[PDB]
Amino acid sequence: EVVMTQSPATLSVSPGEGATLSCRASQSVNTNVAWYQQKPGQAPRLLIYGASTRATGIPARFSGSGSGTEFTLTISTLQSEDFAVYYCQQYSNWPPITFGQGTRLEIKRTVAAPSVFIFPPSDEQLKSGTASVVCLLNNFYPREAKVQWKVDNALQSGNSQESVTEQDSKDSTYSLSSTLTLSKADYEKHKVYACEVTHQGLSSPVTKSFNRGE
């Protein structure tokens, strides 16, 4: 099979600037190459075929070039809506039809500190024997953030998981949710539940907490 290797695996570019995405085939595929854009939760969208021909309906800021083994997709005047994974494809030697592994394009924006919220477990959940404490970091950039849980000042390890939204296509921010999972018995032994947030937009860590029963 013809192996298509895209690079870099991830790219982060400022709005209004250009992005350059590369693809390299393990043997010559002439100009029998296509590029696709895939936004989260959606099907791929054909951008370019024949290495350099823009598909119908595709803005002129998308351009493709190359021949043989080396191919490039250039996206000028980047906008927040261009957040997506971009795939190359070869149709010169098949079966199999082969795709590159994708390049994820993030769009940069102004640093934004998260707003932090903490949520105790519901009384309904406590009937089940488990307690989930949730800490929400809303609308921040960049994506890197550190969230640490303390229960009566004891740092928690091994009992939390975090989830991060896809980058917002309008304002390029992220949101994050960290869930601390405890048994009901452990939840009822302890009093002060706190989540500590570290982020580039915060001069110092931000702590939000609650006291059980208050």
Describe the structure.
The protein has helices at 123-126, 184-189, and strands spanning 4-7, 10-13, 19-25, 33-38, 45-49, 53-54, 62-67, 70-75, 84-90, 98-99, 103-107, 115-119, 130-140, 146-151, 154-155, 160-164, 174-183, 192-198, 206-211. By secondary structure, the protein is mainly beta. It has 2 domains: 1-109, Sandwich (Immunoglobulin-like); 110-211, Immunoglobulin-like (Sandwich), CATH 2.60.40.10. Strands 2, 4, 5, 6, 9, 10 and 11 form a 7-stranded mixed β-sheet that branches. A 4-stranded antiparallel β-sheet has the order 1-3-8-7, with no helix packed on it. The longest helix is centred in the last third of the chain and has 6 residues, at 184-189. The chain starts with a strand and ends with a strand.
Write the layout of secondary structure elements.
Blueprint: E1 4-7, E2 10-13, E3 19-25, E4 33-38, E5 45-49, E6 53-54, E7 62-67, E8 70-75, E9 84-90, E10 98-99, E11 103-107, E12 115-119, H1 123-126, E13 130-140, E14 146-151, E15 154-155, E16 160-164, E17 174-183, H2 184-189, E18 192-198, E19 206-211
Parallel strand pairs: 2-11
Antiparallel strand pairs: 1-3, 3-8, 4-5, 4-9, 5-6, 7-8, 9-10, 9-11, 12-13, 13-17, 14-15, 14-18, 16-17, 18-19
